[model samples]
Target: STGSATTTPIDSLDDAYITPVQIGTPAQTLNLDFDTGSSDLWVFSSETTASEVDGQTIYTPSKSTTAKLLSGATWSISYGDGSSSSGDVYTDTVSVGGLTVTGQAVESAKKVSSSFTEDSTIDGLLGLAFSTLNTVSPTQQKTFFDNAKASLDSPVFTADLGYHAPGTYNFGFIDTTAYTGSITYTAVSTKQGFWEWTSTGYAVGSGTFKSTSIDGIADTGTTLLYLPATVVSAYWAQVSGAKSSSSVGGYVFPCSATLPSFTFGVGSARIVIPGDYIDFGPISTGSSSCFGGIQSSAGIGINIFGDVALKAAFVVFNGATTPTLGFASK
Candidate 1:
């Protein structure tokens, strides 16, 4: 049901690929990523070069009529995809959904890669996740909710992530009627830049994958859900003789039989993923079939429930009300 939305119109072209939110009478905007993993607002600025940033949005202070650049503070961010960006600090008035937030901190990248420069759709990102892993310091960190909390009609932030579909991921005001009323909120942890959580375990079909237990983090920045080799192989095994193949440098599977139902349990909650997500096309790596989701680091670190897994659930980063994260069915 998720991933059915069309692109939204983005203003503030000077702010790279991010969408701009106008804040207050001064008419200032901030660049941000609509990150669901962590809650922090950051932007690229003049200090960044053409090479340091990749597949990210960069904002220019000069272009903004009310933009103000920070003098000395510098920022650099690295993503799990091995992409990084560097830029200088800045401050300005930013607004979203007609709600204005003033004196917001942002970054401006002086150097950016082709991936960032080429895509000119979004101006910046507005992180709608939790505030535990903020790039901004505790003293300086200003979440979108921190600014808009008092003014909002409700004490919630909803994410309308269904791009085109009517009811996707909506944040801000938690619509009580949309959920099952059994929502569990997890305490926030700051070990990673994105909100990380401990997974109770994972399951495919009727079998539990890990007996000793396994840990995973929910990351919105990534598009695919990454699993451990053992877990992936075990899960795929139940998919009716599905064979492993390589595609896009990732493992994929193809089978004539129906794929089994897969579910991942985070604490007491069980999130199920559809079978089509497991059925990826063939890969050029000599394997006839490939996996829609790949297994990169096995038995090494936490598994990532990337965008694929995230879109299936209604995620709430409750930074505005409490230092907690909430997920539920849409």
Candidate 2:
């Protein structure tokens, strides 16, 4: 059977999108970060420290009759931002939208880093990456998508992340009316277990497009677009009063700064990011210091096409002989 789910952006910080997912026999719903970058379904749960959970909703496996402990199984995950979650494992019935899967690996967090502890809105992460990337013990586990795909008419999912608005996620089917023009698909290589692709080229604003092979991963969990330092520096240079603030650790510009739009080459499609979108609000509340949505994670040598970039296009995560990425104007 086909399934679909839609997510609304948290108006306050349009960075991450959250969707409700139910777990266990008599399901308890929790808002999860649908992350395409990582593979692990961990949640703030009965196992988590009370003080750490804060305002977030917690999952209770004991409340469900089907929840069963997996013998000696455990999961540990560390993200790019240094956020982490680790815990014991449980197999339960997990459901998303109209799709439901039994015996789904549900990792209950016993330890949460400051990042997850502080963000009370996100209950946990629902990993969309390949199951091989699952962090569970010696024997890895399959994600909800992987488990559900076997029964689906078609093996695929689509992400329509809107700009500060509600977007849809469809499983097993693609809604043709959601996008404009023909969908341009590019072959993806997942050696690093990420949806890695090579961008054909890019340009800052209306300037001449630079033909450079930029290898990067498509990540929905990440809030910003992190490219190379050199490329990022070039984009910010076009804006006046833009400087790398030591305190901010990234480029910041005047609040009223008229910045140039950024562009990235995906397959043959030239996906353009609006200037206003990149001006990710102010650095601090009511301050004239505005932070850029795009930065450089040069330390890792892997560029990330995060929410800032993905929201501009309708994306398709396809499973074929050679899995591919399809994008279209949304």
Looking at candidate 1, the ten consecutive residues that score lowest on lDDT are 1-10
The C-alpha TM-scores of every prediction are 0.73, 0.97
Task: Write the residue-wise lDDT of candidate 2 on 150-198 in tens digits.
Answer: 8877889888998878898889888999999888888799898888888
Stretches off by above 4 angstroms in model 2 are none
Off by over 4 Å in 1: 1-32, 38-60, 128-141, 146-156, 163-171, 191-193, 206-213, 240-248, 255-259, 278-291, 294-300, 320-322
Top-lDDT structure, candidate number: 2
Model 2: per-residue Cα lDDT at residue 141: 96
Q: What is the C-alpha lDDT of each candidate?
A: 0.54, 0.89
Looking at model 2, report the run of 10 residues with the lowest lDDT sum: 6-15
Model 2, C-alpha of 4: deviation from truth (Å):
1.2
